[PDB]
């Protein structure tokens, strides 16, 4: 479990072309920061 810190977009690898939607999270357990993918067509605007 973690608290959302930022929303970002990531490039795809070379032969493909798209902008993938992710969030940056700070973990409650130990305070570390990770990056996580948000699956779904428009699921990013479910997140504040």
């Amino acid at each position: 479990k973690g608290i959302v810190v930022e929303k970002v977009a990531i490039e795809a690898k070379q032969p493909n072309s798209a902008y993938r939607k992710c969030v940056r999270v700070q973990l409650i357990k130990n305070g570390k920061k990770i990056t996580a993918f948000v699956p779904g067509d428009g699921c990013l605007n479910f997140i504040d």
Binding site: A9, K21, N45
Partner: protein, 43 residues
Amino acid sequence: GSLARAGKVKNQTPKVPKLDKKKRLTGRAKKRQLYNRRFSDNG
């Protein structure tokens, strides 16, 4: 950047309601129907 395009096509597609009832068989009767359709009428 441009992350305001999220959920474009999902909001673009026009909505359509589904069909009415067409209830289906469940369990042993369904297997009976499959057996009859796949084997009985073929010879």
